[PDB]
Design a protein around this nucleic acid. Structure first.
Length: 1077
RNA sequence: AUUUUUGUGCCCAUCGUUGGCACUAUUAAGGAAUGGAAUAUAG
DNA sequence: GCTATATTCCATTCCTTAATAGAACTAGAC
DNA sequence: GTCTAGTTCTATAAGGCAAGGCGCTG
């Protein structure tokens, strides 16, 4: 029920004397250079593992003694690594030779794993182990003795101990406790418990431990049996009894005996090493004298990839075995028939090169409907010619042959509308062998080919060394500390300096590479965020209390916007533009402390100092653990719906509600509390712009720029295109340009759209790429209305960045060609560095735009939950669980559109953020039917689904809308469950407006519009509702949307609400019962 | 231990009135997608 | 009606999963 | 009295498929 997370603060290193920063850098260089030594050594230790080393263990979970050995003996690593490479063919032979037996299925699957042949190769770690023995002159029996002890101590194997512990037991020369003493003592405790198994009091239990230890006190007991180290749980019982905090605690004799029996194995030996002195000597030669902190720090970096990749690879092998078990090899013959397409005459290749077949190549399970249509044509064609005795009807069948093509051609094109277009030739070939293979078998065969290729291509994880980071702290690490604010105050008072500053100091014990001795030194850091939320001190007496959350942030209740003195204001106006932003923040900081507005921050040695040295740059990070206690007594449920182009929404439901609006949900009283859209507003001149929806200024205020763009297009407005045998069409892009140049259009849409048109222009003028160069810089870079200068967090702004990157791609590709060595970033940078920089600037800008959107959306969701929690109580935030949206069976455009969703990225941020607050919990839920369920009716107790609707005026009606509505009236059946809702909803539209299909069907759009206008005018309404997939509105039984208007739909009264607001309620209601007893 | 000029970023035809905001860091691989140039296909 | 399938070669993005960011202690050194 | 620099510590159920959850713009 205890949760732990870390909050990190990045900082800037504020340098000191070159010589002072040189000493720190030299130390950092020392740990980094040494780290690869431990990695090579531990890999070698892994090679020494054998059956006599892992005989009778827990072997983690669902693992095989063989797999544990194979992962240690053989690893996939870079080709240029020191360990000798081995061919995958010899893996089984080497395993048998070392093992003395053949490898099992798990070991075999491991060897079978895919990897990049060009970048990595298998390495024989066993051979590396021999190198250690030969190089260090070690007895095989002696190293084996040490290896066995290391395994018991968790220095090697599946579950590893901390680097600090491993270094201490392996290389420590400090006084160690006597294991024999603990072993007799633990056995005696077990013995008395067996002798008196019915005790049910801690008091009886504490007496037994003391009897076992032959002592009257825990202190005396600890001195004899566990002289040094943390207190064991058994002794902890005696201790807590003396302080009387465990008197009423439940006693379980079997468990105490069982836990004690498990810990017995570790005390059968005294840890007397035989090769540690030699090994320490080799290490000393390569990394210098043994120190616990330095050796431990290097080992931690070395051990992480070795231990982590072993865990990941074992899970991977087990998953792969299961995936292979899932494949139906019994369907392999059917796959052969389907795969026979390449050898048929329906597929033609110059080099006869085939490719993998997937379900989307036949339209997945739709081929079943198509087969039926084909059979009806065939059965009708048989009867026709059976009762068409007259000969010379070759055309009858020839006509039937043509009908088959059109049936397939229609099928492919129809499936192609909402998905990838299936292959006509493949389908024609399959119909030829219709007698040969059943249709269901075809799907099964095509699925087997696709599934087997996917599982077979999965790659193993290579073992790659880490780029090291070193940690300084109060305990179990390199000694380090952040000077405390009180210490800071004292320091400045003793130096006769101003009481407060904006710099942070740390004192860390560092090694002098020259003297090879430890020294403590001070280093200065700078991090306004750390100062504001932690470090700056509340000097005033009677300062506000520390917040429930430690950090002093706006979300935590500290507004931090105090009245500024005129002297402070001058400093901001006075400061250079580069420093104005930081100074204003500091001035407010000094203002809130001066005005006693700064809340206190409780200080503890809770901050870790992480230092990373890249070149001469030092990256110091301060991170602290944040503890939280789970609270499962939720009173409010906050649902979150995530959208790509529309606004995200949230809805809160009160639980165990009693009041005017209470609804009884399956015996649970709930009250919809509120719903809303997630928007991030930024103020400008008493004007606020939502960062998630702003699409840019209208063109009329951008007339020079739009006209400036027009002048360039005019020079290259001559573009040729060929469609439907339309070669040398002499297409004009400027016509298309004006369509987007309307003053009513948003700038971002214009800029994104202009990029595409420019993209097409370059395609026509392939040898005139160079000319667009300067226009691109003004469009994306230098221009005042350039993409880099103005952009929002809206979906359209992101697409604009997408098109801009593609456009640069086109300019580079066209810039180089035949009139073959391949173009690389090196060539493009050489050919055009400025443009190359522009691509990087756009990439870096988009990544910073994406990080922000995730953080700002996360804060709004967390802020609402915190607001609801204070008024009502513990809140459970629920978000849709979105996964596997990008698939190869979907159109690339659909996949490209889906990539910008960011739902998982936002949820991970919310999930991480929720961990810092008590009374807040986050879980993901199934999003199935969340857009079509009538909230608070559906599942109370009946199933209630309704279609999404669009609203517009008769002039706004489009042919697409007209077609959509009719399709819904089709009697053709569908696998999509939601299809029923649209047909049912489409029925209401005819019923509600007194129409008949004949009026909608076979009617010009214009005439259809007139019909709809005459009805609306009679009813005194200007807008009409129609069911549209992805519709903006939902007819809800309840008034979930505050701006909803009641309407009578087909004899029923519903509230027209934003569909997204409805969805947020639906998300909250998914498995709502499980959340409450 | 004193640097006094900066933690990282986000928004805007008006870049400031004290403009308005937000935020866990790192390592490494893997999975699934995308862009551009082109080739082969069937229209 | 932006033709679609597939492939090659150069680049990208969004996300997941293995890790790091130790706790409690005391003999002996200030 | 504190603090450092080393040691040892741990604590031990629920559907199958696959659609659903997303947007366009002329």
């Amino acid at each position: 029920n205890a949760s732990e997370t870390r909050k990190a603060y990045t900082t800037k290193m504020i340098p000191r004397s070159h010589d002072r920063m040189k000493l720190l850098g030299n130390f950092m260089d020392y740990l980094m250079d040494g780290t690869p030594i431990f990695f090579e050594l531990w890999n070698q230790f892994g090679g020494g593992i054998d059956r006599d080393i892992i005989s009778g263990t827990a072997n983690k979970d669902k693992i095989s003694d063989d797999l544990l050995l194979a992962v240690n003996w053989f690893k996939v690593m870079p080709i240029n690594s020191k360990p000798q490479g081995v061919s995958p063919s010899n893996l089984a032979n080497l395993f048998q030779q070392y093992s003395g037996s053949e490898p099992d299925i798990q070991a075999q699957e491991y060897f079978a794993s895919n990897f990049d042949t060009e970048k990595h190769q298998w390495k024989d770690m066993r051979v590396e182990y021999e190198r250690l023995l030969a190089e260090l002159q070690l007895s095989r029996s002696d190293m084996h003795h040490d290896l066995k002890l290391m395994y018991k101590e968790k220095c090697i194997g599946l579950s590893l101990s901390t680097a600090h512990y491993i270094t201490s037991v392996m290389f420590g020369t400090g006084a160690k406790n006597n294991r024999q003493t603990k072993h007799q003592f633990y056995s005696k405790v077990i013995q008395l418990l067996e002798e008196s198994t019915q005790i049910n009091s801690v008091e009886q239990l504490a007496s037994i431990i003391l009897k076992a230890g032959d002592c009257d006190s825990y202190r005396k007991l600890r001195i004899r049996c566990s002289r040094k180290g943390a207190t064991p749980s058994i002794l902890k019982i005696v201790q807590d009894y003396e302080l009387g905090t465990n008197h009423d605690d439940e006693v379980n004799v079997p468990s105490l005996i069982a836990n004690l029996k498990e810990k017995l194995g570790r005390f059968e030996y005294e840890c007397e090493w035989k090769c540690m002195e030699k090994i320490k000597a080799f290490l000393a030669s390569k990394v210098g004298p043994y120190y616990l902190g330095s050796y431990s720090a290097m080992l931690e970096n070395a051990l992480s990839p070795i231990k982590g990749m072993t865990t990941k690879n074992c899970k991977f092998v087990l998953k792969q075995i299961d995936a292979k078990n899932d494949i139906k090899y019994e369907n392999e013959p059917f796959g052969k028939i389907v795969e026979g397409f390449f050898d048929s005459p329906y597929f033609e290749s110059d080099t006869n090169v085939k490719w993998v077949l997937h379900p989307h190549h036949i339209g997945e399970s739709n081929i079943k409907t198509l087969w039926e249509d084909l059979n009806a044509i065939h059965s009708k064609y048989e009867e026709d010619i059976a009762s068409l005795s007259e000969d010379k009807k070759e055309k009858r069948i020839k006509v039937y042959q043509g009908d088959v093509c059109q049936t397939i051609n229609t099928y492919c094109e129809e499936v192609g509308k909402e998905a990838k277009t299936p292959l006509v030739q493949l389908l024609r070939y399959l119909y030829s062998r219709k007698d040969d293979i059943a249709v269901d078998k075809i799907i099964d065969g095509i699925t087997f080919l696709s599934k087997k290729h996917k599982v077979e291509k999965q790659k193993i994880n290579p073992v790659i060394q880490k780029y090291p980071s070193f940690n300084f702290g109060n305990n179990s690490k390199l000694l380090g500390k952040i000077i405390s604010p009180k210490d800071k105050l004292k320091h400045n008072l003793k130096c006769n300096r101003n009481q407060v500053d904006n710099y942070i100091w740390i004192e860390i014990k560092v090694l002098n590479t020259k003297t090879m001795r430890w020294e403590k030194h001070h280093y200065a850091l700078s991090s306004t965020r750390f100062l504001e939320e932690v470090y700056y001190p509340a000097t005033s007496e009677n300062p506000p209390d520390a917040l429930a959350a430690r950090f002093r942030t706006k979300t935590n209740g500290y507004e931090g916007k105090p009245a500024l003195s005129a002297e402070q204001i001058e400093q901001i106006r006075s400061a250079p533009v580069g420093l104005r932003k930081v100074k204003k923040r500091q001035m407010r900081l000094e203002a809130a402390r001066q005005q006693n507005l700064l809340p206190r921050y409780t200080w503890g040695k809770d901050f870790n100092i992480n230092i990373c040295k890249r070149g001469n740059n030092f990256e110091v990070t301060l991170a602290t653990k944040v503890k939280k206690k789970k609270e499962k007594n939720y009173k409010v449920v906050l649902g979150y719906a995530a959208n790509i182009v529309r606004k995200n929404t949230y809805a809160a439901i009160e639980a165990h509600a009693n009041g005017d609006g209470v609804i009884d949900y399956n015996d649970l009283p709930v009250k919809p509390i509120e719903s809303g859209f997630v928007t991030v507003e930024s103020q400008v001149r008493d004007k606020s712009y939502d960062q998630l929806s702003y699409n840019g200024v209208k063109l009329l205020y951008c007339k020079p720029h739009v006209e400036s763009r027009r002048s360039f297009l005019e020079k290259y407005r001559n573009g040729t295109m060929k469609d439907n045998r339309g070669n040398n069409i002499q297409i004009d892009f400027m016509k298309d340009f004006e369509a987007i140049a309307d003053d009513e259009t948003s700038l971002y849409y214009f800029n994104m759209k202009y990029c595409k048109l420019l993209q097409s222009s370059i395609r026509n003028h392939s040898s005139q790429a160079k000319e667009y160069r300067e226009e691109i810089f003004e469009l994306l870079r230098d221009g005042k209305l350039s993409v880099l200068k103005l952009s929002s967090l809206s979906n359209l702004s992101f697409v604009m960045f997408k098109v801009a990157k593609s456009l640069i791609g086109t300019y580079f590709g066209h810039l180089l060609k035949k009139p073959a060595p391949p173009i690389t970033d090196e060539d493009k940078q050489k050919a055009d560095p400025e443009m190359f920089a522009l691509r990087l600037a756009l990439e870096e800008k988009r990544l910073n735009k994406v990080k922000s959107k995730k953080e700002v959306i996360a804060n709004k969701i967390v802020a609402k939950a915190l607001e609801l929690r204070d008024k009502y109580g513990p809140v459970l935030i629920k978000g849709e669980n979105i996964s596997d949206t990008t698939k190869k069976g979907k159109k690339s455009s659909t996949n490209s559109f889906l990539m910008d969703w960011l739902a998982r990225g936002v949820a991970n941020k919310v999930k991480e953020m929720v961990m810092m607050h008590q009374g807040l919990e986050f879980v993901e839920v199934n999003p199935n039917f969340t857009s079509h369920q009538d909230p608070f009716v559906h599942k109370n107790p009946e199933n209630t689904f309704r279609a999404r609707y669009s609203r517009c005026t008769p002039s706004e009606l489009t042919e697409k809308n007209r077609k959509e509505i009719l399709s819904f009236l089709s009697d053709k059946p569908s696998k999509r469950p939601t299809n029923a809702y649209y047909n049912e909803g489409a029925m209401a539209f005819l019923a509600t407006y007194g129409l008949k299909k004949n009026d909608v069907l076979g009617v010009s759009l214009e005439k259809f519009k007139q019909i709809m206008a005459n009805i609306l005018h009679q009813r005194s309404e200007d807008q009409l509702l129609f069911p549209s997939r992805g519709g903006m509105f939902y007819l809800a039984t309840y008034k979930l949307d505050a701006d909803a208007t009641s309407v009578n739909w087909n004899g029923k009264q519903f509230w027209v609400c934003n569909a997204d607001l409805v969805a947020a309620y639906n998300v909250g209601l998914v498995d709502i019962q499980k959340d409450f007893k």
